[PDB]
Design a protein around this ligand. Sequence first.
Ligand code: HEC
Ligand code: HEC
Length: 125
Amino acid sequence: ALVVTDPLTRTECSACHMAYPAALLPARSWTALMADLPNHFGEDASLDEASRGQIESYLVANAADSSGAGRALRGLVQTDTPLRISELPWFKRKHADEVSPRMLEKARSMSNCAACHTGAERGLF
Ligand code: HEC
Ligand code: HEC
């Protein structure tokens, strides 16, 4: 399932986009994100340390490499620490010949999964 099940992560990490599922980035990528929320893609996404710590635990514990080779890892080398799901080789492979300039214009960003996937919040893509 490609769904955030953790309530605090669901709340805090849906404030500005969809709460992205842990399974889509390796643990190192989640750590790096969670270590710099004051400088988060142009926004201040900083949290109180207690909330920050718990969210980091959940993301790392259910990351793409938390149960061996999740699909999202395909085409990654161990020295890659991607900070965007939308920059993964696996993501670009699934989207390349599928998204037209018009579909992309309407979504406004490949970060906006629900603009194209009605079931994105229930894990259906
Ligand atoms: C607003 C104050 C935000 C909060 C709270 C969180 N995030 Fe965020 N995030 C924000 C912006 C403006 C962007 C750029 C979107 C774009 O169109 O380029 C992002 C992006 C991400 C990503 C990358 C998405 C992708 O393209 O692959 C990830 C993985 C991500 N954000 C994670 C994340 C988490 C774990 C959060 C909770 C702690 C969280 N975000 C909150 C703005 C904001
Ligand atoms: C429109 C501009 C899109 C945005 C934004 C995102 N996705 Fe997407 N995605 C889009 C299309 C047209 C398709 C192909 C559908 C098909 O059946 O060919 C996809 C595909 C996926 C998939 C693969 C689904 C499967 O066949 O198993 C996944 C896992 C997926 N998309 C995830 C995903 C996420 C996490 C996004 C936000 C970060 C996202 N997509 C954005 C169109 C669009």
